[PDB]
Ligand binder design. Structure first.
Ligand SMILES: *[C@@H]1O[C@H](CO)[C@@H](O)[C@H](O)[C@H]1NC(C)=O
Ligand SMILES: [Zn+2]
Length: 404
């Protein structure tokens, strides 16, 4: 199993293409084996990059020699990983003895799938677990469908999490959401009213082989586990794979790359499964992608500075979704289009969704901003979930009121 003893996350200030390109170059060709955690944007944002202990010295020396300034934001990755393991280990002991599912914890894919089966069993008239496809390693892809329509197809909102496996707060936020809907139906007047007019489809783990791989082999793994047929390298970036300016900017055609788009659009059977479900249904109004980290809330476009026709509307909804999310804890989110807020990125879920006639396409990037990154402590799940929920309810109330 992957160990990260002495590994450090370094945060680097970057001002122009001189600094951006040399840093981009240095480990897009894998001298030093650096895994970028927060991707190079432009002038603005800070870059986060995981630096293996073996390679601490060369990289820091090189940063000095290239006039790049850095802080060490995580001094020992493995320490954080240890904490997480124990917290998980412990919770599973309690749950096995409890028969409970503790939502304030991180879970195996089996516990997620099971709890989804339990949410449907408990509320048979509202929720059912629908199998939409198969993962590359041939696991079910399980969604929860929420509906008061009694079989009939209604206008619909898609909510998926965990397309990038290491972004554990998304999956955990998603399974908390499923339980939130069923417990707050016939009680909270807004979700009750949402479900009267629309269906909600929830996919907690959009990338299940990667999620299992992160819990058993490599916690920092982000891609699918597809076997790239002219290479020994594994997996594609699920979120670079969609049929939306595929193989454009922000993607690589190198199978070994973390941003590898795949051999063709929707090649990743996990993506195809969702692309197929949605287009078969034909009546999706909302599509919300849940990621981590950076505390962002974004809308199309991402592959171009093209600028979406409904940018104005999407901006206002996102602004109010963020404002309402903040209400809970004081959590501050940036809002804006993808290509500017992060960096030009092709073939993303939300761009495909918008280009396919789903107006309200939104990327959430959840907690945090870099203190723990992907390794967000378990004790922050319920706060992230509870606050994000108000962000989600807002979007879905705009969808309800603006049916087209
Ligand atoms: C990509 O989307 C376009 C527009 O709907 C479609 O014509 C094309 O067949 C798609 N490409 C693939 C290979 O799925
Ligand atoms: Zn992600």
């Amino acid at each position: 199993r992957e160990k990260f003893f002495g590994d450090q996350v370094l945060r680097i200030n970057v001002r122009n293409g001189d600094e951006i390109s040399k840093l981009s170059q240095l480990v897009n060709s894998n001298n030093l084996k650096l895994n970028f955690w927060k991707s190079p944007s432009s002038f603005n944002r800070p870059v986060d990059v995981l630096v293996p202990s073996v390679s601490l010295q060369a990289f820091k020396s090189f940063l000095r020699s290239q006039g790049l300034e850095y802080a060490v934001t995580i001094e020992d990755l493995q320490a954080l990983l240890d904490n997480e393991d124990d917290e998980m280990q412990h919770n599973e002991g309690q749950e096995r003895s409890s028969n409970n599912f503790n939502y304030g914890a991180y879970h195996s894919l089996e516990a997620i799938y099971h709890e989804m089966d339990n949410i449907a069993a408990d509320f048979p008239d509202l929720a059912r677990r629908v199998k939409i496809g198969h993962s590359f390693e041939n696991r079910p892809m399980y969604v929860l469908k929420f509906s008061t329509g009694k079989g009939v197809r209604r206008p619909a909102v898609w909510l998926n999490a965990g397309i990038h496996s290491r972004e554990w707060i998304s999956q955990a936020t998603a399974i908390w959401t499923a339980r939130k809907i069923v417990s707050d139906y016939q009680r909270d007047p807004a979700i009750t009213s949402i479900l009267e007019k629309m269906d909600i489809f929830l996919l907690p783990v959009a990338n299940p082989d990667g999620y299992v791989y992160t819990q058993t082999q490599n916690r920092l793994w982000r891609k699918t586990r597809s076997r790239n047929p002219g290479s020994s390298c594994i997996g594609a970036d699920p979120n670079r794979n969609w049929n939306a300016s595929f193989a454009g900017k922000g993607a690589s055609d190198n199978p070994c790359s973390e941003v590898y788009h795949g051999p063709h659009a929707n090649s990743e059977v996990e993506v195809k499964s969702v692309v197929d479900f949605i287009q078969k249904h034909g009546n999706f109004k909302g599509f919300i992608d849940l990621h981590s980290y950076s505390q962002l809330l974004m809308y199309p476009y991402g592959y171009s500075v093209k600028k979406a026709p409904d940018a104005e509307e999407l901006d206002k909804v996102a602004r109010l979704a963020a404002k309402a999310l903040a209400s809970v804890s004081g959590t501050e989110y940036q809002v804006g289009p993808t290509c500017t807020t992060v960096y030009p990125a092709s073939g993303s879920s939300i761009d495909w969704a918008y280009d396919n006639g789903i107006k309200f396409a939104f990327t959430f990037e959840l907690r945090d901003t870099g203190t723990y990154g992907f390794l967000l402590p378990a004790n922050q799940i319920i706060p992230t979930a509870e606050e994000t929920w108000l962000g989600l309810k807002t979007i879905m109330e705009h969808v309800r009121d603006n049916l087209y």
